[PDB]
Amino acid sequence: FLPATAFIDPEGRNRNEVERLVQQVVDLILAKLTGAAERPPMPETVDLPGPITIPEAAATEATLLQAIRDMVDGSMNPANPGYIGHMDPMPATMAILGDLVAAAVNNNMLSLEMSPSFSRLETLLLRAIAGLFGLGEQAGGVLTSGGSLANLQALAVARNVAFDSVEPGITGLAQRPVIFASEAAHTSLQKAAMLLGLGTAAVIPVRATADSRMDPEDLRARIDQARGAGQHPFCVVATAGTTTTGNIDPLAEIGAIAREHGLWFHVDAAYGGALVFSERHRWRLAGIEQADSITFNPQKWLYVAKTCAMVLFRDAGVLERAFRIPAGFINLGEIGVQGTRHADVVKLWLTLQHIGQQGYARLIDDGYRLAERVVEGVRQRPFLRLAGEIDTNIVCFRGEPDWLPAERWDDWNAALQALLLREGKIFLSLPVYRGGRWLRAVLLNPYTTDAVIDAMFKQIDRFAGRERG
């Protein structure tokens, strides 16, 4: 037996039933999103669900709607204006609808024939985005399900170019291939190094400054040291928007050092790459136009529903030469880590069009303005300290109250994070950084106002007043 609405009949025979079911789900979702501020940024404690059994018989539409209601009510809620803790934003309206459209036609990015109206669009759109990064006329890339895959693919190509490893692999080598990255760079570099057969220890950390920016003098020292240890450097990764503090490495200096030493220059701009849409702020990315490859994630600061990420190459032909396996448009499955892929280009393209470059410029500038308000508040309070200068709309800071022993500060900041969430409905993350627990604000929600930040500080001050501070 099959339920009457298990599939949509292509000759209309269950139209009314399908329309009714779809409408109930759409109405539920619209009620939950237009009323998202009625739910806290994080859900009430879970209740530990028990073993799952796959049912024999079809579930009723009533059961399915209750399931959806429960999954929404139990989910994280970045649409709450007090959600200010992670690089996970509320989705653009056209990103929600773009996924509805993509799931409905259910095409496959594996090949042109399986995605005739999406494949060429993706290739053309990513050439246009590469132009915004200034990479030049040979540039292009592919969409990937997440920035970790984009980093994996960039590093795979860097490895394959340096060691000609597509067919014979790298097991024959007598010196260990190594890459350099900031001590503040993302752990997907180590995951990638493991996957690529380099091992996690192949990612050599470079000292970051007090402002969490890679130190070019230490990069030189580490490169010299690796060669002296008989290692084989092949890539430098600069990070444009570090995860914890949102800082941007000095891309032009790092790139110049990579080029002097013949190393592939990869820029992980997962977060900070969005600045290419801001006339006012994109100078921070100066030097990125010379990258050999760039990772960029519209699912972070371009508000595209997860996942949406890409890897761009200054010479797209490199994917043919040093990636694609042995056998004018190239089937995208041949030149990505994935074969079959969801049509993320639909939500990306609809969202880019709906918001426009000028809309992102507004979002980004307002993000900076809110971050600056947080910085101001932190600076004026002796008991709160910044992790360092900020380069994006992210502020990492913590209490260092001089009336408590330093040994107690982690507990203090943890208790503060919990109180802000439980009583203020304001969510900050609490990363481990420099051996301690720090608070972290990521000012992404378009509906977070100055008043939310003011309310945060009022609660922080009241908490700080408890133990005689």
Query: What are the residues binding Cl ion (CB under 5 A)?
Result: 342, 385-386
Contact partner, 389, from a copy of itself, Cl ion, none, Cβ < 5-8 Å per class? none
- The length of the chain is 469
Q: Report the chain's terminal Cα–Cα distance, integer Å.
A: 69
DSSP class of residue 248 equals B
Cβ 348 to Cl ion shortest distance, Å: 12
Cβ 449 to a copy of itself shortest distance, Å: 11
d(CA 162, CA 258): 14
Q: What are the backbone dihedrals phi and psi of residue 425, each rounded to the nearest 5 degrees, phi first?
A: 55, 35
- Give the distance, in angstroms, between the CA of residue 95 and the centroid of all CA atoms in the same chain: 16
d(CA 23, CA 42): 27
d(CA 297, CA 364): 15
Token pair of 459 as six digits:
């609660």
Cβ 445 to a copy of itself shortest distance, Å: 8
Which C-beta is closer to a copy of itself: that of 28 or that of 404? Answer: 28
Contact partner, 385, from a copy of itself, Cl ion, none, Cβ < 5-8 Å per class? Cl ion
Contact partner, 386, from a copy of itself, Cl ion, none, Cβ < 5-8 Å per class? Cl ion
Which C-beta is closer to a copy of itself: that of 194 or that of 252? Answer: 194
Which C-beta is closer to a copy of itself: that of 323 or that of 433? Answer: 323
Which C-beta is closer to a copy of itself: that of 338 or that of 459? Answer: 338
Contact partner, 375, from Cl ion, a copy of itself, none, Cβ < 5-8 Å per class? none
Q: In terms of C-beta density within 10 A (0-12 exposed, 13-18 middle, 19 or more buried), how is residue 460 classed?
A: buried
Which C-beta is closer to a copy of itself: that of 54 or that of 465? Answer: 54
Which C-beta is closer to a copy of itself: that of 375 or that of 455? Answer: 455
Cα dihedral 129→132→137→141 (10° resolution): -30
Contact partner, 129, from Cl ion, a copy of itself, none, Cβ < 5-8 Å per class? a copy of itself
Cβ 118 to a copy of itself shortest distance, Å: 7
What are the start-end ranges of the H helices in 61-206?
Answer: 61-73, 93-105, 119-133, 147-163, 188-195
Contact partner, 352, from a copy of itself, Cl ion, none, Cβ < 5-8 Å per class? a copy of itself
Cβ 248 to Cl ion shortest distance, Å: 19
